[PDB]
Amino acid sequence: STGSATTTPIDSLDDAYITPVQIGTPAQTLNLDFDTGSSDLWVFSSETTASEVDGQTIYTPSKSTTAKLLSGATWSISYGDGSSSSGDVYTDTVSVGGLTVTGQAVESAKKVSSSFTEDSTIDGLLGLAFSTLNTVSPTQQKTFFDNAKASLDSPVFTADLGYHAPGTYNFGFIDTTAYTGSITYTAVSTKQGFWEWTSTGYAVGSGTFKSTSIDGIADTGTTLLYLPATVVSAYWAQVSGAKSSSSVGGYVFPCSATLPSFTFGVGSARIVIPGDYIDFGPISTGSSSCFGGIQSSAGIGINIFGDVALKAAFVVFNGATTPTLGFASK
């Protein structure tokens, strides 16, 4: 079996992408953020503290004939940005673009931090990292991908994110019309529970490619590209007036400047991120200082190939016994 769903940016800056997901019987459609950097499927629900809900569509397990409370199970998660959520667990039927999983753990949020409450367009997260990161206690739960794996024609899912435009998440097949050239596959380490891989280098604009190993994670749930200070300083030194600002919390650049492209290596292949993808617009409305899409990973401890990098490629997440990541130009 296969599944195919359209994912749409939530705003004009591609801050996040939402994909409709059907939960329960009869279906309740919620717009979830597909996150390859986490492994919990959690939703805003009828149990979420009324003051922490601001416009989201909520899941109501009492209206679903297939919902079952997973007795005693609780969850609690904290994200890299400091945001957090917790609550209880239900099992229910979950379908993504025609692909159905029965008995999927659906983590009902009882409490959510301000960051989630503010984002009225996001009803929850659908985690696609390895099930070893799932926070359900005392019995760890599987991700939607892990549960669907046996039913899939191929144990893969693909991410084809758009630049200021909708894209697609496909499960169980590779659309040979969505990319150009060939797909370069690279080894994945599942040791930390992430889609962790090694980039073979980088180039800034039309500069020469520097071969150097950069370990990092393929993370659809992170907006920006976070790389070592050395790489980020080499990029921003090519933009007139660019600087790191403590007030803002990152590199900013004059909105009038033209940004060079950024190339990252995948084995012997090169992925080119156009300069336009690195522009995140004014730091405040009317400001002449614009926020950069390439930031330092020094304060995080892990390099992250977020949406800025991923949207420049057709990306294959191969969940076979020996996992791999595939990248192709598009």
PDB file of N, CA and C in Angstrom, residues 60-152:
ATOM      1  N   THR A  60     -11.242  14.950  19.418  1.00  0.00           N
ATOM      2  CA  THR A  60     -12.180  14.613  20.475  1.00  0.00           C
ATOM      3  C   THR A  60     -12.363  13.099  20.494  1.00  0.00           C
ATOM      4  N   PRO A  61     -11.610  12.395  21.352  1.00  0.00           N
ATOM      5  CA  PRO A  61     -11.703  10.926  21.357  1.00  0.00           C
ATOM      6  C   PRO A  61     -13.089  10.400  21.709  1.00  0.00           C
ATOM      7  N   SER A  62     -13.899  11.176  22.458  1.00  0.00           N
ATOM      8  CA  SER A  62     -15.240  10.710  22.833  1.00  0.00           C
ATOM      9  C   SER A  62     -16.184  10.564  21.621  1.00  0.00           C
ATOM     10  N   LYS A  63     -15.905  11.291  20.521  1.00  0.00           N
ATOM     11  CA  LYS A  63     -16.676  11.236  19.273  1.00  0.00           C
ATOM     12  C   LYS A  63     -16.154  10.186  18.284  1.00  0.00           C
ATOM     13  N   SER A  64     -15.120   9.419  18.657  1.00  0.00           N
ATOM     14  CA  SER A  64     -14.551   8.423  17.768  1.00  0.00           C
ATOM     15  C   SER A  64     -14.894   7.039  18.278  1.00  0.00           C
ATOM     16  N   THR A  65     -15.513   6.209  17.431  1.00  0.00           N
ATOM     17  CA  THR A  65     -15.908   4.850  17.784  1.00  0.00           C
ATOM     18  C   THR A  65     -14.738   3.883  17.890  1.00  0.00           C
ATOM     19  N   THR A  66     -13.560   4.245  17.357  1.00  0.00           N
ATOM     20  CA  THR A  66     -12.377   3.388  17.388  1.00  0.00           C
ATOM     21  C   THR A  66     -11.319   3.857  18.430  1.00  0.00           C
ATOM     22  N   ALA A  67     -11.580   4.945  19.171  1.00  0.00           N
ATOM     23  CA  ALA A  67     -10.630   5.451  20.154  1.00  0.00           C
ATOM     24  C   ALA A  67     -10.644   4.611  21.433  1.00  0.00           C
ATOM     25  N   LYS A  68      -9.456   4.346  21.980  1.00  0.00           N
ATOM     26  CA  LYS A  68      -9.346   3.577  23.223  1.00  0.00           C
ATOM     27  C   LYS A  68      -8.306   4.249  24.086  1.00  0.00           C
ATOM     28  N   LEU A  69      -8.590   4.464  25.375  1.00  0.00           N
ATOM     29  CA  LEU A  69      -7.582   5.028  26.274  1.00  0.00           C
ATOM     30  C   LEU A  69      -6.484   3.979  26.502  1.00  0.00           C
ATOM     31  N   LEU A  70      -5.213   4.367  26.357  1.00  0.00           N
ATOM     32  CA  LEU A  70      -4.089   3.487  26.636  1.00  0.00           C
ATOM     33  C   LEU A  70      -3.834   3.703  28.136  1.00  0.00           C
ATOM     34  N   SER A  71      -4.524   2.896  28.947  1.00  0.00           N
ATOM     35  CA  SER A  71      -4.546   2.961  30.400  1.00  0.00           C
ATOM     36  C   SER A  71      -3.181   3.058  31.054  1.00  0.00           C
ATOM     37  N   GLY A  72      -2.986   4.134  31.808  1.00  0.00           N
ATOM     38  CA  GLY A  72      -1.772   4.406  32.563  1.00  0.00           C
ATOM     39  C   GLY A  72      -0.651   5.110  31.824  1.00  0.00           C
ATOM     40  N   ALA A  73      -0.694   5.100  30.487  1.00  0.00           N
ATOM     41  CA  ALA A  73       0.373   5.680  29.691  1.00  0.00           C
ATOM     42  C   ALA A  73       0.349   7.186  29.697  1.00  0.00           C
ATOM     43  N   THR A  74       1.519   7.788  29.898  1.00  0.00           N
ATOM     44  CA  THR A  74       1.662   9.246  29.867  1.00  0.00           C
ATOM     45  C   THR A  74       2.856   9.615  28.967  1.00  0.00           C
ATOM     46  N   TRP A  75       2.922  10.876  28.555  1.00  0.00           N
ATOM     47  CA  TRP A  75       4.015  11.365  27.732  1.00  0.00           C
ATOM     48  C   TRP A  75       4.373  12.779  28.155  1.00  0.00           C
ATOM     49  N   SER A  76       5.614  13.159  27.903  1.00  0.00           N
ATOM     50  CA  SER A  76       6.119  14.475  28.236  1.00  0.00           C
ATOM     51  C   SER A  76       7.287  14.724  27.302  1.00  0.00           C
ATOM     52  N   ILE A  77       7.225  15.804  26.503  1.00  0.00           N
ATOM     53  CA  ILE A  77       8.292  16.088  25.555  1.00  0.00           C
ATOM     54  C   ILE A  77       8.745  17.546  25.616  1.00  0.00           C
ATOM     55  N   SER A  78      10.043  17.772  25.389  1.00  0.00           N
ATOM     56  CA  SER A  78      10.671  19.088  25.345  1.00  0.00           C
ATOM     57  C   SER A  78      11.429  19.178  24.029  1.00  0.00           C
ATOM     58  N   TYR A  79      11.207  20.238  23.250  1.00  0.00           N
ATOM     59  CA  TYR A  79      11.896  20.411  21.972  1.00  0.00           C
ATOM     60  C   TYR A  79      13.131  21.330  22.105  1.00  0.00           C
ATOM     61  N   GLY A  80      14.017  21.283  21.110  1.00  0.00           N
ATOM     62  CA  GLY A  80      15.240  22.081  21.074  1.00  0.00           C
ATOM     63  C   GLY A  80      15.026  23.578  21.214  1.00  0.00           C
ATOM     64  N   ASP A  81      13.865  24.072  20.763  1.00  0.00           N
ATOM     65  CA  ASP A  81      13.544  25.499  20.891  1.00  0.00           C
ATOM     66  C   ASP A  81      13.042  25.900  22.301  1.00  0.00           C
ATOM     67  N   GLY A  82      12.976  24.951  23.229  1.00  0.00           N
ATOM     68  CA  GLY A  82      12.475  25.210  24.570  1.00  0.00           C
ATOM     69  C   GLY A  82      10.987  24.949  24.738  1.00  0.00           C
ATOM     70  N   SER A  83      10.251  24.714  23.629  1.00  0.00           N
ATOM     71  CA  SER A  83       8.816  24.438  23.723  1.00  0.00           C
ATOM     72  C   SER A  83       8.550  23.052  24.322  1.00  0.00           C
ATOM     73  N   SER A  84       7.357  22.843  24.895  1.00  0.00           N
ATOM     74  CA  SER A  84       7.040  21.565  25.524  1.00  0.00           C
ATOM     75  C   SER A  84       5.539  21.245  25.543  1.00  0.00           C
ATOM     76  N   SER A  85       5.222  19.947  25.705  1.00  0.00           N
ATOM     77  CA  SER A  85       3.853  19.445  25.789  1.00  0.00           C
ATOM     78  C   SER A  85       3.814  18.103  26.537  1.00  0.00           C
ATOM     79  N   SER A  86       2.656  17.769  27.106  1.00  0.00           N
ATOM     80  CA  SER A  86       2.491  16.534  27.874  1.00  0.00           C
ATOM     81  C   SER A  86       1.006  16.176  27.983  1.00  0.00           C
ATOM     82  N   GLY A  87       0.718  14.936  28.365  1.00  0.00           N
ATOM     83  CA  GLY A  87      -0.657  14.505  28.541  1.00  0.00           C
ATOM     84  C   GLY A  87      -0.806  13.003  28.597  1.00  0.00           C
ATOM     85  N   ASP A  88      -1.970  12.518  28.154  1.00  0.00           N
ATOM     86  CA  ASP A  88      -2.236  11.086  28.172  1.00  0.00           C
ATOM     87  C   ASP A  88      -2.274  10.491  26.759  1.00  0.00           C
ATOM     88  N   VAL A  89      -2.482   9.174  26.640  1.00  0.00           N
ATOM     89  CA  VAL A  89      -2.402   8.499  25.357  1.00  0.00           C
ATOM     90  C   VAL A  89      -3.638   7.707  25.008  1.00  0.00           C
ATOM     91  N   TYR A  90      -4.059   7.838  23.759  1.00  0.00           N
ATOM     92  CA  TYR A  90      -5.142   7.050  23.200  1.00  0.00           C
ATOM     93  C   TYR A  90      -4.586   6.231  22.024  1.00  0.00           C
ATOM     94  N   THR A  91      -5.276   5.175  21.637  1.00  0.00           N
ATOM     95  CA  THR A  91      -4.980   4.456  20.399  1.00  0.00           C
ATOM     96  C   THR A  91      -6.195   4.731  19.504  1.00  0.00           C
ATOM     97  N   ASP A  92      -5.960   4.924  18.207  1.00  0.00           N
ATOM     98  CA  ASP A  92      -7.041   5.200  17.258  1.00  0.00           C
ATOM     99  C   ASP A  92      -6.541   4.934  15.841  1.00  0.00           C
ATOM    100  N   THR A  93      -7.443   5.006  14.875  1.00  0.00           N
ATOM    101  CA  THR A  93      -7.103   4.824  13.480  1.00  0.00           C
ATOM    102  C   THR A  93      -6.587   6.147  12.957  1.00  0.00           C
ATOM    103  N   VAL A  94      -5.471   6.118  12.214  1.00  0.00           N
ATOM    104  CA  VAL A  94      -4.848   7.336  11.684  1.00  0.00           C
ATOM    105  C   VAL A  94      -4.534   7.097  10.214  1.00  0.00           C
ATOM    106  N   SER A  95      -4.947   8.016   9.321  1.00  0.00           N
ATOM    107  CA  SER A  95      -4.690   7.860   7.904  1.00  0.00           C
ATOM    108  C   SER A  95      -4.022   9.108   7.383  1.00  0.00           C
ATOM    109  N   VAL A  96      -3.002   8.908   6.540  1.00  0.00           N
ATOM    110  CA  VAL A  96      -2.286   9.989   5.867  1.00  0.00           C
ATOM    111  C   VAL A  96      -2.336   9.736   4.364  1.00  0.00           C
ATOM    112  N   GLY A  97      -3.058  10.590   3.654  1.00  0.00           N
ATOM    113  CA  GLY A  97      -3.185  10.524   2.204  1.00  0.00           C
ATOM    114  C   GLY A  97      -3.625   9.186   1.655  1.00  0.00           C
ATOM    115  N   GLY A  98      -4.575   8.545   2.348  1.00  0.00           N
ATOM    116  CA  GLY A  98      -5.110   7.244   1.967  1.00  0.00           C
ATOM    117  C   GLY A  98      -4.447   6.055   2.647  1.00  0.00           C
ATOM    118  N   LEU A  99      -3.331   6.274   3.344  1.00  0.00           N
ATOM    119  CA  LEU A  99      -2.600   5.198   4.020  1.00  0.00           C
ATOM    120  C   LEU A  99      -3.084   5.123   5.451  1.00  0.00           C
ATOM    121  N   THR A 100      -3.672   3.989   5.840  1.00  0.00           N
ATOM    122  CA  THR A 100      -4.284   3.812   7.151  1.00  0.00           C
ATOM    123  C   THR A 100      -3.532   2.879   8.123  1.00  0.00           C
ATOM    124  N   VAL A 101      -3.385   3.326   9.368  1.00  0.00           N
ATOM    125  CA  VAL A 101      -2.804   2.540  10.440  1.00  0.00           C
ATOM    126  C   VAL A 101      -3.867   2.438  11.533  1.00  0.00           C
ATOM    127  N   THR A 102      -4.170   1.218  11.957  1.00  0.00           N
ATOM    128  CA  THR A 102      -5.109   0.990  13.037  1.00  0.00           C
ATOM    129  C   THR A 102      -4.275   0.826  14.327  1.00  0.00           C
ATOM    130  N   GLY A 103      -4.784   1.325  15.447  1.00  0.00           N
ATOM    131  CA  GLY A 103      -4.085   1.203  16.727  1.00  0.00           C
ATOM    132  C   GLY A 103      -2.855   2.083  16.881  1.00  0.00           C
ATOM    133  N   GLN A 104      -2.825   3.235  16.193  1.00  0.00           N
ATOM    134  CA  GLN A 104      -1.714   4.172  16.323  1.00  0.00           C
ATOM    135  C   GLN A 104      -1.852   4.898  17.664  1.00  0.00           C
ATOM    136  N   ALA A 105      -0.761   5.052  18.420  1.00  0.00           N
ATOM    137  CA  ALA A 105      -0.786   5.832  19.653  1.00  0.00           C
ATOM    138  C   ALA A 105      -0.943   7.326  19.275  1.00  0.00           C
ATOM    139  N   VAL A 106      -1.981   7.973  19.811  1.00  0.00           N
ATOM    140  CA  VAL A 106      -2.277   9.376  19.584  1.00  0.00           C
ATOM    141  C   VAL A 106      -2.122  10.057  20.942  1.00  0.00           C
ATOM    142  N   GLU A 107      -1.070  10.837  21.092  1.00  0.00           N
ATOM    143  CA  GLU A 107      -0.793  11.497  22.360  1.00  0.00           C
ATOM    144  C   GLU A 107      -1.624  12.765  22.506  1.00  0.00           C
ATOM    145  N   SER A 108      -2.580  12.716  23.415  1.00  0.00           N
ATOM    146  CA  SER A 108      -3.493  13.822  23.647  1.00  0.00           C
ATOM    147  C   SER A 108      -2.834  14.834  24.559  1.00  0.00           C
ATOM    148  N   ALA A 109      -2.649  16.070  24.084  1.00  0.00           N
ATOM    149  CA  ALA A 109      -2.021  17.097  24.908  1.00  0.00           C
ATOM    150  C   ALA A 109      -2.951  17.657  25.969  1.00  0.00           C
ATOM    151  N   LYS A 110      -2.565  17.529  27.232  1.00  0.00           N
ATOM    152  CA  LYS A 110      -3.297  18.130  28.337  1.00  0.00           C
ATOM    153  C   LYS A 110      -2.735  19.548  28.580  1.00  0.00           C
ATOM    154  N   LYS A 111      -1.401  19.724  28.424  1.00  0.00           N
ATOM    155  CA  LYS A 111      -0.720  21.001  28.600  1.00  0.00           C
ATOM    156  C   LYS A 111       0.226  21.261  27.425  1.00  0.00           C
ATOM    157  N   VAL A 112       0.243  22.503  26.919  1.00  0.00           N
ATOM    158  CA  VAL A 112       1.137  22.916  25.834  1.00  0.00           C
ATOM    159  C   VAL A 112       1.792  24.258  26.211  1.00  0.00           C
ATOM    160  N   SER A 113       3.054  24.460  25.820  1.00  0.00           N
ATOM    161  CA  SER A 113       3.737  25.728  26.096  1.00  0.00           C
ATOM    162  C   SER A 113       3.195  26.840  25.150  1.00  0.00           C
ATOM    163  N   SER A 114       3.448  28.118  25.496  1.00  0.00           N
ATOM    164  CA  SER A 114       2.976  29.272  24.733  1.00  0.00           C
ATOM    165  C   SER A 114       3.284  29.212  23.232  1.00  0.00           C
ATOM    166  N   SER A 115       4.463  28.705  22.856  1.00  0.00           N
ATOM    167  CA  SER A 115       4.854  28.602  21.448  1.00  0.00           C
ATOM    168  C   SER A 115       3.837  27.845  20.587  1.00  0.00           C
ATOM    169  N   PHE A 116       3.274  26.741  21.113  1.00  0.00           N
ATOM    170  CA  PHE A 116       2.293  25.973  20.364  1.00  0.00           C
ATOM    171  C   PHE A 116       0.951  26.712  20.307  1.00  0.00           C
ATOM    172  N   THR A 117       0.518  27.295  21.446  1.00  0.00           N
ATOM    173  CA  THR A 117      -0.726  28.068  21.557  1.00  0.00           C
ATOM    174  C   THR A 117      -0.779  29.220  20.537  1.00  0.00           C
ATOM    175  N   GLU A 118       0.356  29.927  20.358  1.00  0.00           N
ATOM    176  CA  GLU A 118       0.493  31.051  19.427  1.00  0.00           C
ATOM    177  C   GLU A 118       0.242  30.632  17.972  1.00  0.00           C
ATOM    178  N   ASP A 119       0.722  29.435  17.574  1.00  0.00           N
ATOM    179  CA  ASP A 119       0.585  28.909  16.210  1.00  0.00           C
ATOM    180  C   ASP A 119      -0.789  28.260  15.984  1.00  0.00           C
ATOM    181  N   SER A 120      -1.799  29.081  15.674  1.00  0.00           N
ATOM    182  CA  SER A 120      -3.177  28.651  15.434  1.00  0.00           C
ATOM    183  C   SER A 120      -3.340  27.697  14.247  1.00  0.00           C
ATOM    184  N   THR A 121      -2.414  27.718  13.281  1.00  0.00           N
ATOM    185  CA  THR A 121      -2.512  26.847  12.111  1.00  0.00           C
ATOM    186  C   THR A 121      -2.023  25.412  12.376  1.00  0.00           C
ATOM    187  N   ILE A 122      -1.214  25.200  13.423  1.00  0.00           N
ATOM    188  CA  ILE A 122      -0.672  23.872  13.706  1.00  0.00           C
ATOM    189  C   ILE A 122      -1.466  23.157  14.810  1.00  0.00           C
ATOM    190  N   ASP A 123      -2.116  22.035  14.462  1.00  0.00           N
ATOM    191  CA  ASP A 123      -2.915  21.235  15.406  1.00  0.00           C
ATOM    192  C   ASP A 123      -2.105  20.162  16.160  1.00  0.00           C
ATOM    193  N   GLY A 124      -0.871  19.952  15.750  1.00  0.00           N
ATOM    194  CA  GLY A 124      -0.011  18.969  16.380  1.00  0.00           C
ATOM    195  C   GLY A 124       1.154  18.558  15.514  1.00  0.00           C
ATOM    196  N   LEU A 125       1.922  17.582  16.018  1.00  0.00           N
ATOM    197  CA  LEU A 125       3.109  17.091  15.347  1.00  0.00           C
ATOM    198  C   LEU A 125       2.950  15.620  15.023  1.00  0.00           C
ATOM    199  N   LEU A 126       3.515  15.203  13.901  1.00  0.00           N
ATOM    200  CA  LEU A 126       3.545  13.794  13.551  1.00  0.00           C
ATOM    201  C   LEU A 126       5.038  13.442  13.441  1.00  0.00           C
ATOM    202  N   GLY A 127       5.544  12.721  14.434  1.00  0.00           N
ATOM    203  CA  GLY A 127       6.962  12.407  14.507  1.00  0.00           C
ATOM    204  C   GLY A 127       7.387  11.309  13.567  1.00  0.00           C
ATOM    205  N   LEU A 128       8.487  11.529  12.828  1.00  0.00           N
ATOM    206  CA  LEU A 128       9.010  10.568  11.854  1.00  0.00           C
ATOM    207  C   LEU A 128      10.489  10.199  12.069  1.00  0.00           C
ATOM    208  N   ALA A 129      11.044  10.466  13.271  1.00  0.00           N
ATOM    209  CA  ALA A 129      12.393  10.007  13.621  1.00  0.00           C
ATOM    210  C   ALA A 129      12.258   8.476  14.092  1.00  0.00           C
ATOM    211  N   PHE A 130      13.308   7.845  14.676  1.00  0.00           N
ATOM    212  CA  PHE A 130      13.211   6.438  15.063  1.00  0.00           C
ATOM    213  C   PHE A 130      12.397   6.286  16.344  1.00  0.00           C
ATOM    214  N   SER A 131      11.649   5.178  16.487  1.00  0.00           N
ATOM    215  CA  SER A 131      10.773   4.985  17.648  1.00  0.00           C
ATOM    216  C   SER A 131      11.485   5.005  19.010  1.00  0.00           C
ATOM    217  N   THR A 132      12.817   4.862  19.027  1.00  0.00           N
ATOM    218  CA  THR A 132      13.600   4.932  20.263  1.00  0.00           C
ATOM    219  C   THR A 132      13.515   6.309  20.933  1.00  0.00           C
ATOM    220  N   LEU A 133      13.123   7.382  20.193  1.00  0.00           N
ATOM    221  CA  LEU A 133      12.948   8.695  20.826  1.00  0.00           C
ATOM    222  C   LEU A 133      11.546   8.931  21.377  1.00  0.00           C
ATOM    223  N   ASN A 134      10.599   7.996  21.186  1.00  0.00           N
ATOM    224  CA  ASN A 134       9.223   8.212  21.648  1.00  0.00           C
ATOM    225  C   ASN A 134       9.175   8.390  23.171  1.00  0.00           C
ATOM    226  N   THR A 135       8.374   9.338  23.667  1.00  0.00           N
ATOM    227  CA  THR A 135       8.382   9.657  25.099  1.00  0.00           C
ATOM    228  C   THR A 135       7.307   8.957  25.923  1.00  0.00           C
ATOM    229  N   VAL A 136       6.533   8.036  25.319  1.00  0.00           N
ATOM    230  CA  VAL A 136       5.464   7.374  26.054  1.00  0.00           C
ATOM    231  C   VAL A 136       6.046   6.428  27.092  1.00  0.00           C
ATOM    232  N   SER A 137       5.514   6.529  28.309  1.00  0.00           N
ATOM    233  CA  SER A 137       5.924   5.771  29.470  1.00  0.00           C
ATOM    234  C   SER A 137       4.687   5.162  30.137  1.00  0.00           C
ATOM    235  N   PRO A 138       4.786   3.950  30.725  1.00  0.00           N
ATOM    236  CA  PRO A 138       5.971   3.078  30.794  1.00  0.00           C
ATOM    237  C   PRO A 138       6.247   2.227  29.550  1.00  0.00           C
ATOM    238  N   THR A 139       5.331   2.246  28.586  1.00  0.00           N
ATOM    239  CA  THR A 139       5.460   1.439  27.381  1.00  0.00           C
ATOM    240  C   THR A 139       5.719   2.321  26.155  1.00  0.00           C
ATOM    241  N   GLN A 140       6.953   2.319  25.647  1.00  0.00           N
ATOM    242  CA  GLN A 140       7.316   3.127  24.484  1.00  0.00           C
ATOM    243  C   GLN A 140       6.476   2.773  23.249  1.00  0.00           C
ATOM    244  N   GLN A 141       6.042   3.786  22.487  1.00  0.00           N
ATOM    245  CA  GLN A 141       5.195   3.544  21.314  1.00  0.00           C
ATOM    246  C   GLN A 141       5.917   3.752  19.994  1.00  0.00           C
ATOM    247  N   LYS A 142       5.397   3.140  18.924  1.00  0.00           N
ATOM    248  CA  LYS A 142       5.949   3.250  17.587  1.00  0.00           C
ATOM    249  C   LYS A 142       5.426   4.479  16.853  1.00  0.00           C
ATOM    250  N   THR A 143       6.226   5.005  15.923  1.00  0.00           N
ATOM    251  CA  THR A 143       5.775   6.110  15.070  1.00  0.00           C
ATOM    252  C   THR A 143       4.779   5.588  14.022  1.00  0.00           C
ATOM    253  N   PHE A 144       4.073   6.514  13.336  1.00  0.00           N
ATOM    254  CA  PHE A 144       3.176   6.197  12.247  1.00  0.00           C
ATOM    255  C   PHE A 144       3.946   5.444  11.145  1.00  0.00           C
ATOM    256  N   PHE A 145       5.177   5.890  10.831  1.00  0.00           N
ATOM    257  CA  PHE A 145       5.977   5.265   9.773  1.00  0.00           C
ATOM    258  C   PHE A 145       6.324   3.808  10.115  1.00  0.00           C
ATOM    259  N   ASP A 146       6.746   3.582  11.364  1.00  0.00           N
ATOM    260  CA  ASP A 146       7.105   2.270  11.873  1.00  0.00           C
ATOM    261  C   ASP A 146       5.931   1.307  11.867  1.00  0.00           C
ATOM    262  N   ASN A 147       4.744   1.791  12.237  1.00  0.00           N
ATOM    263  CA  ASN A 147       3.533   0.987  12.226  1.00  0.00           C
ATOM    264  C   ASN A 147       3.094   0.650  10.793  1.00  0.00           C
ATOM    265  N   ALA A 148       3.260   1.581   9.851  1.00  0.00           N
ATOM    266  CA  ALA A 148       2.838   1.393   8.460  1.00  0.00           C
ATOM    267  C   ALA A 148       3.797   0.554   7.618  1.00  0.00           C
ATOM    268  N   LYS A 149       5.078   0.469   8.035  1.00  0.00           N
ATOM    269  CA  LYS A 149       6.184  -0.187   7.323  1.00  0.00           C
ATOM    270  C   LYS A 149       5.858  -1.542   6.682  1.00  0.00           C
ATOM    271  N   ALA A 150       5.199  -2.435   7.428  1.00  0.00           N
ATOM    272  CA  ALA A 150       4.861  -3.759   6.916  1.00  0.00           C
ATOM    273  C   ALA A 150       3.886  -3.659   5.739  1.00  0.00           C
ATOM    274  N   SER A 151       2.919  -2.737   5.816  1.00  0.00           N
ATOM    275  CA  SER A 151       1.934  -2.564   4.756  1.00  0.00           C
ATOM    276  C   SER A 151       2.450  -1.830   3.536  1.00  0.00           C
ATOM    277  N   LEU A 152       3.572  -1.102   3.640  1.00  0.00           N
ATOM    278  CA  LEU A 152       4.070  -0.303   2.522  1.00  0.00           C
ATOM    279  C   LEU A 152       4.679  -1.136   1.408  1.00  0.00           C
TER     280      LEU A 152
END
